[PDB]
Amino acid sequence: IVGGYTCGANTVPYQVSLNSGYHFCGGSLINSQWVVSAAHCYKSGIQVRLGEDNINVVEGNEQFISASKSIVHPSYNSNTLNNDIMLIKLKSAASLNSRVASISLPTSCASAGTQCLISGWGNTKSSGTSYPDVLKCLKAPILSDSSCKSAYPGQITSNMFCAGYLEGGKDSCQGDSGGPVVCSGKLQGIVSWGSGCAQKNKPGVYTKVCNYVSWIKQTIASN
Ligand SMILES: [NH3+]Cc1ccc(F)cc1
Numbered sequence: 001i002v003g004g005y006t007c008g009a010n011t012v013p014y015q016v017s018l019n020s021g022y023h024f025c026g027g028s029l030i031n032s033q034w035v036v037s038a039a040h041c042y043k044s045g046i047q048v049r050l051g052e053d054n055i056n057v058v059e060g061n062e063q064f065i066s067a068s069k070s071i072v073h074p075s076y077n078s079n080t081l082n083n084d085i086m087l088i089k090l091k092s093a094a095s096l097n098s099r100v101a102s103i104s105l106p107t108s109c110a111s112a113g114t115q116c117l118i119s120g121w122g123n124t125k126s127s128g129t130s131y132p133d134v135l136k137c138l139k140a141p142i143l144s145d146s147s148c149k150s151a152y153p154g155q156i157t158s159n160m161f162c163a164g165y166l167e168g169g170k171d172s173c174q175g176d177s178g179g180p181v182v183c184s185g186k187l188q189g190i191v192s193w194g195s196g197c198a199q200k201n202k203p204g205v206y207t208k209v210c211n212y213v214s215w216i217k218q219t220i221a222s223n
C-alpha cells in the first residue's frame, strides 16, 4: 500500500496472508473454512495465515492453516485479468474470535463515490521498493466507470472497477494482490491490477465481487 497508514494489530480481522515460504498475496476470510483471493495469486502448496499483524514475528494471535483445495474462476483470463478471483478451502476450520473474523459478501454492488478500506502487506513506494512487516491500510473511493475506462482505454470489463485517486500518491501495490476492498462492512473488491502504483491517472483496478456471489455460494455449497 502506497500513501496509507498502519492499520493497527488485528483491526482488519478478515485479512489473510497467503504464504508459500514467504508472503506473496493477500486474501479475505469469508467463512471459517473459505478464503477468497485473486486468481493471478494461484500457486500450489499455499498455507493460509490468519490473525497476522507483523508477518515476520509470531505475536500470539496467528492461525496457520494449510489449503486443501483451490478453485480458480472457470473463466479467468490471465492475459486480460478478467474474472480474477479464486476460492481456497482450508484443511480445517478457522477458530473465529474478535481478531479472526469473516467478512460478509455483498447483496448489492457498490456505487462510485463509496468510500472503502483497502489493506495489505505490499510495497509502500511508487518508485523503488520497500515492504512493510505490519499491515497497512488505505481509505479510497470507488471511481465512476467512465473515469475508470478513460484511465484504461479498452481494458475495463464489467467485472472490474477502479478505486483510488486520479491525482495519484495513494494506491495498492505489488504484494497487496488478492487482498480486500471492504465498503460499508461488505467485501466489494479484490486487489487485482493497475499500471504501476500511485501514478497520476492510473488508479488501482479491482475485481467486482458482487458479480460473483452466486458462483461463490454454489461452489462452497458443493465442495
Ligand atoms: N496499483 C494497483 C496495483 C495493485 C496490485 C499490483 F500487483 C499492481 C498494481
Ligand SMILES: [Ca+2]
Pocket (backbone or CB within 6 Å): 052, 053, 054, 055, 056, 057, 058, 059, 062
Ligand atoms: Ca505474526
